[PDB]
Symmetry: C3
Subunit: 149 residues, 3 copies
Amino acid sequence: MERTFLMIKPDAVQRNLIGEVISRIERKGLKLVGGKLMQVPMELAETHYGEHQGKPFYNDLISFITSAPVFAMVVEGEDAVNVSRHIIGSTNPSEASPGSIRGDLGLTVGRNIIHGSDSLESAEREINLWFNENEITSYASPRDAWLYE
Amino acid sequence: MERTFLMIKPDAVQRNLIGEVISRIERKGLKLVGGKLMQVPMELAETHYGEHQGKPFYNDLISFITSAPVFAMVVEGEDAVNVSRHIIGSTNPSEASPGSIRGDLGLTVGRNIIHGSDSLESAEREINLWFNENEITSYASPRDAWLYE
Amino acid sequence: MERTFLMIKPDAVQRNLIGEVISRIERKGLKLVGGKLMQVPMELAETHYGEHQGKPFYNDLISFITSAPVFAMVVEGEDAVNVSRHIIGSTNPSEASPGSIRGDLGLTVGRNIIHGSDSLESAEREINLWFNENEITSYASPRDAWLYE
């Protein structure tokens, strides 16, 4: 079943919104399958974000993501990548639909609560970069037969 | 005053979301005027979903809606039919706006939490099919003068 | 830093939603900088709503806004005017996005829970009309460095 990588960013951690953000992911029907609070080492940050190395904001993005712990997640469900992006909302919290994590909780592009993989391909990369096979569990849940048919 | 038929579906029931869903209906200003927890008899399911008799998904719909109790509702308010459809969101929870019942709580089209009448005529038909007039109460509420002009 | 004027209307007050609405404002990252529960004098209502002095709905506007206390607010943050309008939602709660204050809480245009300044000009205008300089506080908050760069 499809998986994506989500990460609760240091702004959410420092605003004490960890539980609230998990709750929104959970209630949507997505299954938390891996999860760890962690300080992000500099090279993880640079390899996770290098698409952006050239850009002006780059050195701010790296400083921010390493400034306090993040909550790294692997999340499972039918169409999980797009589902996550859907409930997370647009990159810019002022464009993100009310009701979405970024729409309800964030102000600025740079401080936008959470990260989600933008595609199937980057999901498998991101999951691989952040987690080892043995940190990601597999389990049936009571609601599974009620989420899907 | 306008009325529509809503039904909390077995997925929501089995996921223990009854209160949450009623809360969203209630806080919107809609007045719960009829409500019952019920097992759906096969015939009621078939006549309720009659339009879909021919379609591939039909049997699955009938099995699903009869698999565990639903919470059947009559709800009252200005423009109730449309208001309900608005807060419920698009049929497909992945298209439904974040903040809507389906947008926040559902994953798949077949397991999408709640039903709402799609029009005025199907509202009276569904109300009639699921409830007897003596099951539908009428009452003034303190907030009525504050919801409307 | 940018400021706008918000006012929780008497329908919201009389529906006991004051805390709920403040919570939505608060969690978005906006900083409450002035706040007062107040009966609106006729004099203020008429000048506040002076644009509409010719229109059919005008008297109803004035009656309604003076019919019970409102909670008047000055709210601060980057792009605060548009950020407030965004989480408040469209004038008509049936057009407002689910997840917005109006989309989740209101039914009719006339009874739509909250007001927010429509522009920078009228923010400045409304802030001045409703509050005195000494009623609006200025303060740093712990989360400020985590909302913005």
